[PDB]
Structures are given as C-alpha cells and as structure tokens.
Amino acid sequence: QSMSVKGRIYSILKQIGSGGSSKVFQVLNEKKQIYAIKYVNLEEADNQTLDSYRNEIAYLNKLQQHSDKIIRLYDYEITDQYIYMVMEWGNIDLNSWLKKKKSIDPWERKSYWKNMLEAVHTIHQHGIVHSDLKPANFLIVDGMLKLIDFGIANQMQPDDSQVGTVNYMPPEAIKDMKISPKSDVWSLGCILYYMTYGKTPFQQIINQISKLHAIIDPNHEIEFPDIPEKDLQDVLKCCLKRDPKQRISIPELLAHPYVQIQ
Numbered sequence: 264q265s266m267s268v269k270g271r272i273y274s275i276l277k278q279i280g281s282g283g284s285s286k287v288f289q290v291l292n293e294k295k296q297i298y299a300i301k302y303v304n305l306e307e308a309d310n311q312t313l314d315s316y317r318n319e320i321a322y323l324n325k326l327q328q329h330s331d332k333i334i335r336l337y338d339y340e341i342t343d344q345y346i347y348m349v350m351e352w353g354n355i356d357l358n359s360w361l362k363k364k365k366s367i368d369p370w371e372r373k374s375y376w377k378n379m380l381e382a383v384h385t386i387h388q389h390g391i392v393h394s395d396l397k398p399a400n401f402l403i404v405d406g407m408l409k410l411i412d413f414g415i416a417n418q419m420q421p422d423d424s425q426v427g428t429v430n431y432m433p434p435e436a437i438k439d440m441k442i443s444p445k446s447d448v449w450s451l452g453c454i455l456y457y458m459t460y461g462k463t464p465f466q467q468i469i470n471q472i473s474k475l476h477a478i479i480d481p482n483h484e485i486e487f488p489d490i491p492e493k494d495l496q497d498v499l500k501c502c503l504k505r506d507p508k509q510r511i512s513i514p515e516l517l518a519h520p521y522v523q524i525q
C-alpha cells in the first residue's frame with residue numbers, strides 16, 4: 264500500500280497509531296527517507312471538527328519557524344474528504360518510553376525537562392494553553408523531546424478508545440465548574456514527578472472521584488521524598504502549588520538552577 268502527497272509517492276511500512284477518523288503511518292519516500300504520515304478521514308466530520316484540524320495544522324505550520332521542539336511538518340494535502348500530513352519520524356512517544364524504563368538517568372531527565380519547557384513556552388507565546396498535557400504528547404526524535412499536539416484536535420494512541428487520565432489535571436480546572444499558562448506548569452510538574460519518583464502525585468488513589476477531590480484539597484499534602492538533586496526537589500515543589508498565582512511560571516523555570524546548572 265502507498266499514498267501520494269503533493270505529487271510525492273510514499274510507501275507504507277506500518278500503522279504507528281490511530282484515533283477517531285485518523286491513522287498515523289511509518290512511511291518511506293522515493294529516496295527511502297522515513298516519515299510519519301497522519302491520514303484523517305473527513306467524510307463524517309462536522310464544522311467544529313474541521314476547524315479543530317485546520318487550527319492544529321495552522322499552529323504546526325506557524326510554530327515550525329519558532330522552535331525545533333515542535334514536531335516538523337514537511338508537507339500536507341487537504342481536500343473535502345481527507346487530510347495527509349507529512350511529518351518527521353520519531354523513535355517512540357515519552358509515555359511508551361516511561362513504561363519500558365526501569366529507572367531514568369538524571370542527565371536524560373534534565374535534558375527531557377528542558378525540551379518540554381521550550382516546546383510549552385513556544386505555544387504559550389502564541390497564545391495557546393494546551394490544558395491536556397501528558398507524556399504521550401511528547402515524542403523522542405534523535406535524543407530530543409518534541410511536542411506533537413496542541414490540545415486542539417483528536418489524540419492518537421499507539422498501535423482502548425475510552426482510555427483517559429486525570430493524573431496530570433491541574434486543580435484550577437476541576438475547581439472551575441481559571442485555566443492559564445500556569446495550568447500547563449502543573450501538568451509538566453506531574454510529568455517530572457513521574458520521571459523522578461516513578462509515580463504521579465495522586466496515582467495511589469483508586470477512585471477517579473476521590474482523585475479529583477485530592478487534586479483540589481489543600482489539606483492533601485503531596486509527598487516529596489528526599490533525593491540527591493536538591494534543585495530537582497525544589498522544581499517539583501514550585502510546579503505543584505495548588506494556587507496558580509503561587510505556582511512558578513515557565514520563564515522562571517527556564518532560569519532555575521536545575522535547567523541551567525549541571
């Protein structure tokens with residue numbers, strides 16, 4: 264099986280992932296260069312869903328020139344029936360990687376954290392608040408993490424369609440029933456906490472309702488066990504402040520000893 268994008272032919276090696284009416288493929292061009300092609304079937308898509316895909320593509324296109332920590336979009340084809348998006352190929356998403364790993368190297372953790380801060384800082388500068396950050400939103404491309412979605416369109420699962428997670432959800436979002444660039448700091452904080460302690464802050468709470476209650480309860484103290492990297496411990500405490508006004512910002516996190524000193 265093959266496909267054509269803007270007069271260029273690509274052969275399909277396999278399906279990497281899926282989600283809703285979209286499929287992600289590992290492909291080769293004519294020079295045998297590897298790419299990821301996202302195919303989106305638009306036949307049963309409404310105006311709200313069309314706008315979400317148009318907005319994602321537009322932000323991907325714009326942000327290319329602003330940071331190398333956003334996945335490269337090389338070409339695309341858009342009609343009334345489908346979307347083809349030609350992107351750079353990555354080895355694995357951060358979530359599948361964190362599942363394989365028994366323990367993480369402190370230097371790899373630090374490098375990954377800096378990439379995540381740079382990618383998220385760039386989207387904030389263009390007025391995007393992701394609000395749904397989790398490790399699966401990051402892709403490893405040549406020892407570097409790259410953001411692959413903006414929380415604007417449908418999420419891809421590597422190849423259960425009910426699968427979600429409340430584990431990275433900021434308290435203000437739950438309370439508001441508010442969401443600012445600070446909301447993404449809390450989610451990045453939960454990812455770093457996972458990379459440090461091997462669990463997310465509220466993972467042990469079984470019931471999802473009890474979990475949401477724990478996220479917003481100031482009386483529920485998050486445990487921060489003593490570790491050799493005192494700067495890392497400090498980053499974690501600053502990110503996971505329940506009050507977003509008290510919570511550290513991304514420009515401040517980029518000037519922190521943990522990211523700048525090694």
Ligand SMILES: Cc1ncc(-c2ccc(Nc3cc4c(cn3)cc(-c3cnn(C)c3)n4C(=O)OC(C)C)cc2)n1C
Binds near residue numbers: 351352419420
């Ligand atoms: C164990 C395991 N499960 C899944 C994987 C795995 C393997 C390879 C990849 N590589 C990969 C995935 C990619 C892309 C480029 N490379 C681009 C995308 C993409 C889709 N939409 N947008 C805007 C970008 N992408 C993607 O969505 O991957 C999903 C399946 C995790 C991603 C995940 N692995 C290694």
